[PDB]
Enzyme design. Sequence first.
Site, PDB file in Angstrom:
ATOM      1  CE1 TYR A  51      -4.370   0.563  -0.140  1.00  0.00           C
ATOM      2  CE2 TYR A  51      -4.155  -1.607   0.649  1.00  0.00           C
ATOM      3  CZ  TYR A  51      -5.010  -0.532   0.277  1.00  0.00           C
ATOM      4  OH  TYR A  51      -6.403  -0.957  -0.200  1.00  0.00           O
ATOM      5  CD  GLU A  53      -4.415   5.410   0.202  1.00  0.00           C
ATOM      6  OE1 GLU A  53      -5.610   4.714   0.020  1.00  0.00           O
ATOM      7  OE2 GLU A  53      -4.464   5.873   1.627  1.00  0.00           O
ATOM      8  CB  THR A 223      -4.306   3.817 -22.394  1.00  0.00           C
ATOM      9  OG1 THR A 223      -3.937   3.767 -23.727  1.00  0.00           O
ATOM     10  CG2 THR A 223      -5.449   3.997 -22.117  1.00  0.00           C
ATOM     11  NE  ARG A 232      -5.955  -4.411 -20.440  1.00  0.00           N
ATOM     12  CZ  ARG A 232      -6.087  -4.297 -21.877  1.00  0.00           C
ATOM     13  NH1 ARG A 232      -6.631  -2.972 -22.328  1.00  0.00           N
ATOM     14  NH2 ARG A 232      -5.453  -4.915 -22.940  1.00  0.00           N
TER      15      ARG A 232
HETATM   16  N1  LIG Z   1      -9.890   5.762   9.154  1.00  0.00           N
HETATM   17  C1  LIG Z   1      -8.889   5.572   8.108  1.00  0.00           C
HETATM   18  N2  LIG Z   1      -7.891   5.165   8.176  1.00  0.00           N
HETATM   19  C2  LIG Z   1      -7.199   5.338   7.103  1.00  0.00           C
HETATM   20  C3  LIG Z   1      -7.304   5.420   5.761  1.00  0.00           C
HETATM   21  C4  LIG Z   1      -8.895   5.980   5.678  1.00  0.00           C
HETATM   22  O1  LIG Z   1      -9.307   6.204   4.441  1.00  0.00           O
HETATM   23  N3  LIG Z   1      -9.508   5.872   6.934  1.00  0.00           N
HETATM   24  N4  LIG Z   1      -6.614   5.327   4.780  1.00  0.00           N
HETATM   25  C5  LIG Z   1      -7.229   4.917   3.404  1.00  0.00           C
HETATM   26  O2  LIG Z   1      -6.631   4.508   2.476  1.00  0.00           O
HETATM   27  C6  LIG Z   1      -5.220   5.509   4.972  1.00  0.00           C
HETATM   28  C7  LIG Z   1      -5.000   6.921   5.115  1.00  0.00           C
HETATM   29  N5  LIG Z   1      -5.122   7.756   3.859  1.00  0.00           N
HETATM   30  C8  LIG Z   1      -5.471   8.995   3.891  1.00  0.00           C
HETATM   31  C9  LIG Z   1      -5.047   9.813   2.775  1.00  0.00           C
HETATM   32  C10 LIG Z   1      -5.475  11.270   2.876  1.00  0.00           C
HETATM   33  C11 LIG Z   1      -6.097  11.861   3.915  1.00  0.00           C
HETATM   34  C12 LIG Z   1      -6.732  13.232   4.021  1.00  0.00           C
HETATM   35  O3  LIG Z   1      -7.627  13.495   4.290  1.00  0.00           O
HETATM   36  N6  LIG Z   1      -5.626  14.016   3.224  1.00  0.00           N
HETATM   37  C13 LIG Z   1      -5.950  15.536   3.378  1.00  0.00           C
HETATM   38  C14 LIG Z   1      -5.185  16.275   4.437  1.00  0.00           C
HETATM   39  C15 LIG Z   1      -3.780  15.512   4.912  1.00  0.00           C
HETATM   40  C16 LIG Z   1      -2.926  16.397   5.446  1.00  0.00           C
HETATM   41  O4  LIG Z   1      -2.345  17.126   4.424  1.00  0.00           O
HETATM   42  O5  LIG Z   1      -2.713  16.744   6.530  1.00  0.00           O
HETATM   43  C17 LIG Z   1      -5.273  16.071   1.975  1.00  0.00           C
HETATM   44  O6  LIG Z   1      -4.769  15.411   1.320  1.00  0.00           O
HETATM   45  O7  LIG Z   1      -5.782  17.363   1.789  1.00  0.00           O
HETATM   46  C18 LIG Z   1      -6.596  10.932   5.002  1.00  0.00           C
HETATM   47  C19 LIG Z   1      -6.345   9.593   4.856  1.00  0.00           C
HETATM   48  C20 LIG Z   1      -4.786   4.907   6.227  1.00  0.00           C
HETATM   49  N7  LIG Z   1      -6.011   4.681   7.332  1.00  0.00           N
END
Ligand SMILES: Nc1nc2c(c(=O)[nH]1)N(C=O)[C@@H](CNc1ccc(C(=O)N[C@@H](CCC(=O)O)C(=O)O)cc1)CN2
Lengths: 405, 405
Positions: A51, A53, A223, A232
Amino acid sequence: MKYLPQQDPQVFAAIEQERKRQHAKIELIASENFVSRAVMEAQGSVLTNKYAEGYPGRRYYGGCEYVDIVEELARERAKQLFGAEHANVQPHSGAQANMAVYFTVLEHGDTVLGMNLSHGGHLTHGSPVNFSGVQYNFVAYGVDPETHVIDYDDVREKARLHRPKLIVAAASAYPRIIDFAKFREIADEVGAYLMVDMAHIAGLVAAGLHPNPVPYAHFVTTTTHKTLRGPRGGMILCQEQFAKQIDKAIFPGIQGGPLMHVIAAKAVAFGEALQDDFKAYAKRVVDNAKRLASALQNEGFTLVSGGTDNHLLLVDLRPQQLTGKTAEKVLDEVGITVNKNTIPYDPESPGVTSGIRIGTAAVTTRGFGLEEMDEIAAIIGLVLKNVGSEQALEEARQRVAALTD
Amino acid sequence: MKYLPQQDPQVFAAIEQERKRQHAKIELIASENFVSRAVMEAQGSVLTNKYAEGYPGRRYYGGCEYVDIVEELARERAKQLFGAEHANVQPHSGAQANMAVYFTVLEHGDTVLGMNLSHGGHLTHGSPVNFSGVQYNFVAYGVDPETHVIDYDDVREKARLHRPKLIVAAASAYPRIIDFAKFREIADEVGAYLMVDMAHIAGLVAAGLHPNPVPYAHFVTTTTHKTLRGPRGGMILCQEQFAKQIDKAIFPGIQGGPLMHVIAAKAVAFGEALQDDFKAYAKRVVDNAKRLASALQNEGFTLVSGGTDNHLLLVDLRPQQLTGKTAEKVLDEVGITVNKNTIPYDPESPGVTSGIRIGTAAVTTRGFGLEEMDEIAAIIGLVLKNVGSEQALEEARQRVAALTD
Ligand SMILES: Nc1nc2c(c(=O)[nH]1)N(C=O)[C@@H](CNc1ccc(C(=O)N[C@@H](CCC(=O)O)C(=O)O)cc1)CN2
Ligand SMILES: Nc1nc2c(c(=O)[nH]1)N(C=O)[C@@H](CNc1ccc(C(=O)N[C@@H](CCC(=O)O)C(=O)O)cc1)CN2
């Protein structure tokens, strides 16, 4: 394969069946290609377990030390390949790539100018059954009824009349060169962003065989699996001023975890595209398209725009008194795999269709040349001009088998 | 691997380092797992070359005879695995699985009831920096500030007050059993649809170790790569009355061509989950998490909800003055891989957080038992309490290598 035949014979048998079919048939679907074994090993790797992200150095998980490298390779090779200031390689698809850019510059219900589906445009360019037509107010431009070429005067008229926020240029079935400078000229006149969807011609752009939209567009979507000959997936290219916005649109905007193994595979695909032998490959696709088009014309088929300037051609099957659905099925029986395709002003809906779309990208990859294109067109002729003849059907099967041998 | 090391040394080195790290480190990312070599072989197959837009029998391309079999196997097994009346195995992602459902039952701006991010809910369950919160009006429900358990009375209140068109249940960081009976009961009270996101808990549901949402939910979305131990991607499960509309929402709604190779691996994973092996595995996942939770509490850690009923646990790190971001970085140093995670009522932003999330699905796959969980909790206790201590970080490194061999 070692462990799949043991644990799952049903799935293994089905895959082997398919693996043989890709070798025994002649793949002429314009959007299809055969990837290297290095590309397959990359997506068949452990990177599926991770993971990641976020983006390199800015992740929401630990242990991303090594997937960050894989993603950087992908981004940098992409920027090197197309000259773009910024790249996003996380889009799971072309659809998701297009979706992200729309999410970046357009509010709900915004006016967008896109190429009509039947005229050559893609589903994500404003189809009423797609999210694009539903979400945003799409007005459609198209081609000439006789020459089947983009009417840029039509485009300007629409742009001046409807005052769109974004103009989308590019197509899924337009055999001709698109002039991105004219599109930009029109976009600046009406104060609009320009998006170009190079998905089909992405490998041709990288090889200098189609003009580059990057210097003329704010956003470039693609793509990775068509003429770029990769896994893909999707990709977005943009100017530095839209970098952060585009990145946020992908995540946390419209996607979650990226496919790191597919991203690894993208990096290999781009590495392969940077090599000289890919330019040589791309030339053969274009040459094989020009020849096949002319060879199909010799059999007495009619083609939209009178031929092709790129990788794909579009057969108008109206004089042959057949639909694309029949042509596809009957050719598939003998060994030729195509796709039923809608022609400009097609009398039939996109499930029936009045033509077939043919691409040379897949067959070039497996070593087919000019002499081979001639035989392909002759088989298509033998089959489509003698529909119900079991004799012609069987002769075609022997001839296709002789090619794939 | 046979062809990638020779073709692309830079990409191959990164993959091997990642491969080594997966073994060397203790991977405690709750949403991560390790797929079988059979699943990996399927994703790396030639099925990546096939455009298969549409559905088995309803394809917009030719040559699909075999990929159809792959998809049918994936669907029929998923129905057998969960007892669903219909399944869609084309979603590229859990993100895209959810998006299509929202695209089915909802129009732009519509009211949707979903779990708050910091209280346990997912990004796609209504974040304002996510399409879900931008496209739809999301009202948030959460957990009790003292017990950290879903306040169902609040859910009922929020539902009566806002009269949503859809209720979304299930989470990304909820360490307890979600009562689906109550959610449907609430959903029927206000006439709303019910969607459950079992992504995290799919594997446990398949094994009869978590109440199955299928009987209670109109739609059941999931990822295949979490506790289900399959490839990276999504899936939609739904009642027969929504079947056709769901298939249309995926395509031509929000997605283009499906990832057929991933769908093959989806079929392989469900087959692994149907075996007697999987139920035993899933039992150990829950047992290991329960032991690791208790062991962490003996070390003095404050746990959100006071323990775990599933594969997941949240450590409230405020008592030890550490942010989640810091705790993630320090555990990575010693060889323990987690992710920083928001806790209920987090004073910090999602990029910093007041806690860490830990899962056992991945370490159980490699054969860790109840005794390993004791050691893991001890190491985590040694490190997070002696942050700056360089001799404490080294002992941890040695104890991590003793576990991972
Ligand atoms: N409860 C919960 N835990 C989780 C997730 C989730 O969706 N929910 N996630 C799902 O995979 C991961 C966390 N991923 C996340 C990514 C971005 C933001 C978010 O709100 N970002 C904002 C502000 C962040 C900042 O800059 O401080 C932004 O990007 O503007 C939150 C969670 C891991 N654990
Ligand atoms: N010009 C063009 N050709 C193309 C595509 C395209 O997007 N544009 N394709 C890339 O996608 C492929 C075909 N995919 C398509 C899938 C669905 C529909 C469509 O409009 N389906 C409607 C109408 C069905 C009917 O009336 O027959 C539907 O399902 O409701 C069109 C193209 C190959 N050729």
